[PDB]
Automatic annotation (TrEMBL), chain A:
Residues at which Mg(2+) 3 binds: D327, D344
Annotated keywords: ATP-binding, Coiled coil, Metal-binding, Nucleotide-binding, Nucleotidyltransferase, RNA-directed RNA polymerase, Transferase
Domain of life: Viruses
Name of the protein in its database record: RNA-dependent RNA polymerase
Residues reported in the UniProt entry to bind Mn(2+): D326
Presence of the UniProt keyword Transferase in the record: yes
Shown segment, full-protein numbering: 12 to 671 of 1257
Native source species: Thosea asigna virus
Residues involved in Mg(2+) 2 binding: D326, D344
Residues at which CDP binds: T531
Segments forming a coiled coil: 43-62
């Protein structure tokens, strides 16, 4: 027995798979059109301008530093019917291999849209802003060869800067496989060697074959044997992966990435993800220097302001410092006036010293094994493995040659805990920075002295422009900005909802358009239209809704995208001003307003007619 | 993004669709084997036994009536209503020379084979032995021609006998389409004319084409025009459907069923299903004569016992009478001694008078339109349509000839409210019966006098054997029965859990085996059907009969692991402890899983115990 609504919903889900039928069912559908900027150009003209800039830009596009280890044999581990290393993949004469992919980034689809609905001039300029083999190696060299400063760090200092709740920690004393089942990762991401499959496809092989083998050798202290017998089990894969690398920049850059094996990453992820849950951010505990895990939504932006205004006079009282990897937010007072600095660090990953990494892993491991003392020995061995993964893991750039980092110092970007390690290093530097301030070195507020201090004493290079101390709008009227500075890539601003003020992130329209234009078989036509649609929704949610011009451009793309792409398998909602303001406020979560309100019924071949039983005659 | 456990669950669901791969993953799976009776016969030896009895059974089945009793209304044209690219009447079905037509067709050894192997061959033979077109016509004739007596019925009497909670009533004042979307029906069932498709396939066409047209003519009082223009919209389809018409017979019988159109059925279902929710059963309110909606589970069996022992002395105090369609449970006291009668009415549907049908339709509508007065007229018109459906709907038995019932009296089985209509008729009879008892006509406790009362006064025929009053074991010792009589097809029994007593339904193994032998295309589906049927009987109380528990457990254990854990899904078995927890007031729990670790195995994962608490 099934309700007619349920029978209709079931039909809707089944009919969503046919894009052809979706067009027919949604022909004259009522559409909730979002705010849209008027069309500045024609279709064929925005296409032509886009093609021009794309071609012109694309025409401009055209290992002894590493320790060189031998070539690695493919591991012969067999799980039932199939080898854990698939036959005919990443195998050159019995030795593991990899092919350089120098990848496709979709840049002309977004360019066309921006040309049509925005200024042709401004679109042209912001577009002109690469990562080939040469650039990849240079960036690799810098990261792996940078000299670092070892930091004076103790467990006590790490308890102050990074408080945690011990009761919130996962009971790591229980069975390992259940623990590994609890961790979350991207199923489509590569599992690495020896699987060379997606984590989803390789999950059985890892969980019942490789990881048990790893565990048995850990507990017998026989890990050296495993390295000789099956060396692919510990090998990583260096790739050039386009991701959101500097926290200061929401924009995506293509930089070296290290893909460690699934069994190693997952086993370490137990500790990492558990610590993330228990770790406290600056708003929860004032002592924390930690911003890792801070979200602007559900009042986070307001809480950052509340926490920032508790800063004290430099010298007399403690400042407010929050670090999220490379990016940090500093709040101090001079003669009772709130000041804000939003400093950033260049490279960062290459600048993290090995005593910090060892201290973070010790801190994480100690926390778990303190609350759950029955499993001390095991995870201490896991901690040693984490350090190997972060510093000296063997990796495969191109071909069959295996490489290793010559210096222990320097972080292997992409290891579990990458962002945590960065956060700790920065916090350690800025903690000492505040200590010298209380000592009586207030010159360190000035750009010259500060940038020198962090380079000399803590081995960290401050990005030019980021040390620009500015006065703060502590009591901001409707529409005003906190400061023009960017923390976590966004500026804090105040917006009006009824009579209350809602703290929300903002950026200038120029930065929004740049993010729109930045490029990110792999070739499908209808997929292209959905990509532009979801990116527009995403930018709107991230704060482009608050900039007037940006709202129009994103709103234009939302309204331009076909009903078939909007309601497909599926989310068919659009970010409205009102919804986005509720997101960043302490309001209970809401679902996005639906673009096509009558879509649910229409896709189930039902055209609702209103039959009124109330007014009857 | 996704937890590794969640990724494995996704793998589990996707891999269930491949039954071939299921056995491979489930090769050496640990199975929780249910209690099972030993195999008395060999595979093909019991098979031959089954085949033999099968043919001999057909030797009795396989070894006349006119149609003039019905009013003959001629041929109905196929309705030309079209929605978009496709007409509401599909091309090439149920249509001869432009006129609506119907072709109807007027051997299941699988269960017999299983019963032959695991139980005594003789008893299987005997229970197996215990009429197509001709039988259908005679049964049709009976219900349509039976003489009925009109009942003295008012809303006042119906409020006493059938209390409801008005706040539980659906807001019938709102928009109709939302209201009809809320009703629940069988999607695989036939939508009837003119769709001639499953309700699922016809649901859009009904909702956007036919139902609006109906509503537009309803509000214009122009329904007569619609009947003439498109007569197939009001036509029903009489068929021989294997269903549970007799509620005392848990077994399915093949009897006449009337399949009304979807738009008519769904529109009326709004009121009927809404009233069903608000209706109160006998345990909830002692004044209620209503047993429709009674469930034995969650203490229902005990709740019936508690309510029944509240009966009073015949004459001085009011009895406890509960009616569920034809079946009724009567409790009275003589010298302080509890007695139980379990009477049934034969035919029943044909014996329900039209003034009763009209009064309940009034009762349902009045309830809705009193609490929600703004839609008074509309649902009053729907009520007029409801009465037409229960009494004088045109129907199509075989071929193109249309028929109608000659008398308004008599219920057309299959209309919305069928069981409610019958329940009310019975309640009216037993209320007057109780009035005669309090007045001083206690001679009606005897079978002879009572049957006369119900035939003469209320036009109701009691099948002989159903009126055999028996003393009741008010406090039944562990294992003992309430009485040997069958209410709602089952006997009440007491079973022991710890020191507490759990009132549970029971039947003799013979009756359990009978239900096993009577049923209703691909081989693996057959094996799954046997699995679910065995589980169902266990849950219905066959777990409590020793022999029946064994045979049912045998079929469960015989079912292949691929068939047990497949997408239907449900991979659990009814255990003794689980079933007692079901019928008791225990919070609901899930069935014990046949293969406990199957969930992980289907995702190609064998659980590893790797202990982090290791000493090293």
């Amino acid at each position: 027995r099934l309700s007619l609504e349920a029978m209709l919903a079931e039909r809707a889900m089944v009919a969503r798979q046919d894009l052809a039928g979706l067009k027919r069912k949604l022909a004259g559908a009522d559409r909730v059109l979002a705010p849209q900027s008027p069309e500045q150009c024609g279709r064929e003209s925005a296409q032509a301008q886009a093609r021009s800039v794309t071609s012109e830009l694309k025409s401009a596009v055209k290992l002894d530093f590493l320790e060189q280890l031998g070539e690695y044999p493919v591991c012969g581990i067999l799980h039932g019917d199939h080898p854990v290393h698939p036959s005919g993949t990443h195998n050159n004469n019995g030795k593991v291999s990899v092919k350089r992919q120098f990848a496709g980034v979709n840049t002309s689809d977004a360019l066309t849209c921006a040309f049509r609905f925005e200024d042709s001039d401004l679109v042209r300029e912001t577009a002109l802003k690469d990562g080939t083999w040469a650039g990849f190696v240079q960036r690799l060299k810098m990261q792996t060869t940078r000299k670092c400063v070892q930091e004076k760090v103790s467990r006590k200092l790490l308890k102050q800067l990074f408080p945690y709740d011990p009761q919130k920690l996962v009971d790591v004393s229980g069975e390992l496989s259940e623990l590994v089942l609890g961790i979350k990762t991207n199923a489509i991401a590569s599992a690495g060697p020896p699987y060379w499959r997606t984590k989803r496809d390789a999950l059985p092989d890892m969980l019942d074959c490789v990881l048990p083998l790893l565990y048995d050798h850990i507990v017998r202290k026989d890990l050296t044997t495993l390295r000789n017998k099956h060396p692919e089990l510990f090998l990583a894969e260096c790739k050039n992966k386009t991701d959101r690398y500097e926290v200061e920049s929401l924009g995506e850059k293509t930089r070296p990435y290290f893909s460690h094996p699934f069994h190693l990453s997952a086993l370490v992820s137990v500790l990492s993800q558990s610590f993330s849950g228990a770790l406290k951010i600056m708003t929860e505990d004032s002592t924390s220097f930690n911003a890792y895990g801070f979200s602007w939504t559900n009042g986070g932006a307001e809480d950052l302001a509340i926490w920032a205004r508790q800063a004290g006079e430099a010298g007399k009282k403690p400042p407010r410092i929050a670090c999220y990897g490379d990016d940090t937010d500093i709040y101090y007072r001079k003669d009772g006036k709130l000041y804000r600095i939003c400093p950033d660090f260049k490279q960062m990953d290459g600048s993290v010293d090995a005593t910090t990494i060892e201290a973070v892993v010790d801190y994480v491991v100690d926390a778990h094994v303190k609350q759950y003392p029955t499993a001390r020995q095991f995870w201490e061995e896991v901690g040693k493995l984490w350090v190997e993964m972060a510093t000296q893991s063997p990796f495969l750039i191109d071909g069959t040659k295996v490489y290793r980092k010559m210096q222990k110092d320097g972080l292997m970007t992409g290891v579990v805990g990458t962002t945590l390690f960065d956060t700790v290093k920065s916090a350690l530097a800025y903690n000492d920075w505040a200590d010298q301030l209380m000592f009586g070195s207030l010159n360190l507020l000035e750009e010259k002295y500060a940038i020198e201090f962090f380079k000399n004493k803590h081995g960290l290079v401050i990005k030019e422009g980021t040390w620009k101390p500015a006065l703060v709008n502590e009591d901001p009227g409707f529409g005003e900005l906190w400061t023009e500075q960017k923390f976590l890539g966004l500026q804090l601003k105040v917006v009006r909802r009824e009579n209350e003020k809602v703290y929300v992130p903002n950026l200038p329209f120029e930065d929004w358009l740049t993010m729109w234009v930045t490029p990110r078989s792999k070739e499908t036509e209808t997929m292209r239209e959905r990509t532009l649609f979801d990116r527009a929704r995403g930018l709107l949610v991230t704060g482009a809704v608050f900039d007037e011009r940006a709202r129009g451009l994103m709103g234009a793309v939302i309204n331009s995208t076909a009903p078939e792409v909007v309601c497909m398998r599926i989310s068919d909602g659009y970010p409205s001003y009102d919804w986005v303001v509720s997101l960043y406020s302490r309001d209970h979560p809401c679902d996005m307003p639906r673009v096509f309100p009558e879509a649910a019924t229409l896709i189930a071949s039902y055209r609702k007619q209103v039959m009124d039983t109330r007014v009857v005659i």
